[PDB]
């Protein structure tokens, strides 16, 4: 029941090892090891068969075979119901007492979820057969009074160390386009007409490491970008992108919200592969993907979605709801002050947020023949309760960077209050 700061899509979550059912349904056996004696329990794999456990909320789509394919995409798991990995426990009893050795079968719990708009619409739990648990302790007295105890509720308990690793995977129902040649400093990709029928991903790599501005010609629709986990330093060709069919993807930045007019600014390394997810364009007029290397401190925004703000020519509150970045990550807003430019003319503004807390930085965006440049106008250590106003030059453009420090809600609301 916690906020999950990720875009819509599929995720495979490794929820830990050591899971086993209640009522000793996974108990292999108990050994009474008398003092000055050694006991041992072994899983020798004289048979390589294992018995996975599966549970789904939608058997037609999230079938076991489907979930297994996801798990393969996420962690590259090869074998699901077989194993050649042996495990064995060995304990020696002290000279003074007897020992009880209990061994159980265990499972690693992988959760598959279909995450849509801060909500889980489908869910499957796959329990991968693991390498057991062994509990040793002082042997109980054969005379200990028998206590009538009610059986526990049917279910699983977690025995291993705490773990929660989220790995996102390419949505298998959305096609993958590829930009074969390592994109130079400037590049424009024409979005195929297939985009009219469903979202797609575009796989590519930059020829030169640096910061890039990526966007559509109208700053619409919004774009999401991922990194192909493990794609770095494998096969490589300076004049061709070598594919690895890596379906495990790390979310860099981006949004799903339709009206979110914006562009991305992210740091990209040439030794890696990336995926840009383009939403479905329900139009008939060709769209484009524009890549542009950026020199200068525009990198301050590195790995962030820059939301261009609309309807600023009024007084008072100016809200903007957007998917909140995770604690520690950015989300930017671009402001072109309403009115005409002539240094003197200005307008009073008050930057604030409503759901989530964060640290803000206000920049003055300046154009040059050596790229863009930012000038820090001020910093804010409390956005939720900021009341400090600031006067901005009319006709000028400002960028406000928010660094989430407290993730209370799925969405973060930015308020560019206008005092006048």
């Amino acid at each position: 029941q916690t906020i999950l700061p990720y875009p819509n899509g599929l995720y495979v979550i490794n929820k830990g090892d050591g899971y086993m059912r209640t009522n000793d349904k996974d108990l292999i056996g108990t050994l009474l090891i008398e003092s000055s004696t050694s006991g041992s329990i072994i899983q020798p794999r004289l048979r390589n068969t294992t018995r996975p456990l599966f549970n789904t909320s939608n058997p037609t789509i999230f079938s076991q075979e489907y979930t297994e394919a996801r798990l393969n995409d996420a962690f590259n798991i090869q074998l699901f119901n077989t194993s050649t990995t042996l495990f064995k426990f060995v304990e020696e009893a002290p000279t003074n007492k007897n020992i009880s050795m209990k061994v159980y079968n265990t499972y690693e719990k992988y959760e598959l979820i279909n995450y849509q708009n801060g909500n889980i619409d489908d869910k499957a739990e796959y329990y991968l057969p693991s390498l057991g648990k062994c509990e040793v302790s002082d042997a109980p007295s054969p005379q200990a009074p028998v206590v009538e105890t009610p059986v526990d509720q049917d279910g699983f308990i977690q025995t291993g160390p705490n773990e929660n690793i989220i790995v996102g995977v390419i949505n298998p129902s959305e096609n993958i386009e590829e930009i074969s040649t390592p994109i130079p400093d400037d590049y424009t990709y024409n979005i195929p007409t297939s985009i009219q029928n469903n979202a797609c991903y575009v796989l590519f790599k930059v020829n030169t490491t640096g910061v890039y501005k990526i966007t559509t010609k109208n700053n619409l629709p919004p774009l999401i970008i991922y990194e192909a986990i493990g794609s770095s330093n494998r096969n490589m060709n300076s004049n061709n992108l070598s594919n690895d069919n890596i379906k495990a993807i790390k979310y860099i930045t981006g949004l799903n919200r339709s009206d979110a007019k914006s562009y991305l600014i992210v740091s990209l390394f040439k030794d890696k592969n990336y995926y840009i997810r383009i939403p479905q364009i329900s139009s008939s007029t060709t769209s484009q993907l524009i890549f542009k290397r950026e020199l200068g401190n525009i990198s301050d925004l590195a790995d962030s979605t820059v939301n261009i703000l609309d309807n600023l020519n009024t007084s008072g509150t100016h809200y903007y709801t957007r998917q909140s970045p995770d604690v520690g990550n950015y989300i930017s807003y671009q402001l072109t002050i309403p009115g005409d430019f002539n240094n003197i003319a200005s307008s009073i503004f008050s930057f604030r947020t409503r759901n989530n807390q964060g640290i803000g930085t206000l920049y003055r965006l300046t154009e040059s023949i050596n790229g863009y440049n930012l000038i820090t106008i001020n910093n804010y250590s409390d956005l939720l309760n900021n009341v400090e106003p600031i006067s901005l030059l009319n006709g000028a453009t400002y960028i406000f960077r928010v660094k989430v420090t407290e993730l209370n809600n799925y969405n973060i609301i930015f308020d560019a209050y206008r005092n006048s």
Binding site: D26, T30, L31, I33, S38
Partner: protein, 170 residues
């Protein structure tokens, strides 16, 4: 006595615990002899083909009724049986004396009881092969040994007995 349970009327399936050894089967598997600081090891593999369940049905609770009701709440020993599991025990013989250790299978005792007025009226019993247990004694060709060491006349649990139940419905 043993038939007095503090439970509402009706049928129940009870896990009497792991660690049960059966009557007079003590030495069915054999014994091992060693001496002078040597290390003796004995082990096995409860492969389905070998270790098999012991049923003790009653008029109200037949073999099938017992199995299904047991494998439903507790470990499904039928599925498990297809996967070979091993266990071993080792002990070092004393400086200048002889050591003898013998092995016997341990079981999990399950019961299907009929409760009527806080006393068991009917009782079915099931022993599921679990693992094994070894008993050792030091000796010499002259020593007399308590026969209790070699013989167990009545089923018993080498661990603390248990009573974990669940009312049977339908």
């Amino acid at each position: 006595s043993i038939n007095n349970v503090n439970l509402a009327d009706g049928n129940y399936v009870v896990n009497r615990g792991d660690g049960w050894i059966l009557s007079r089967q003590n030495q069915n598997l054999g014994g091992n002899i060693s001496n002078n600081g040597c290390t003796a090891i004995v082990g096995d593999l409860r492969i389905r083909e070998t270790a098999t369940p012991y049923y003790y049905p009653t008029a109200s609770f037949n073999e099938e009724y017992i199995k299904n009701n047991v494998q439903n709440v507790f470990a499904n020993f039928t599925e498990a049986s297809e996967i070979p599991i091993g266990f071993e025990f080792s002990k070092t013989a004393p400086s200048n004396k002889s050591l003898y250790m013998y092995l016997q299978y341990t079981y999990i005792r399950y019961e299907i009881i009929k409760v009527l007025q806080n006393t068991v009226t009917e009782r079915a019993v099931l022993y599921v092969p679990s693992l094994g247990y070894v008993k050792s004694i030091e000796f010499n060709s002259e020593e007399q040994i308590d026969k209790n060491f070699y013989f167990t006349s009545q089923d018993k649990c080498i661990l603390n007995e248990k009573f974990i139940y669940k009312k049977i419905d339908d």
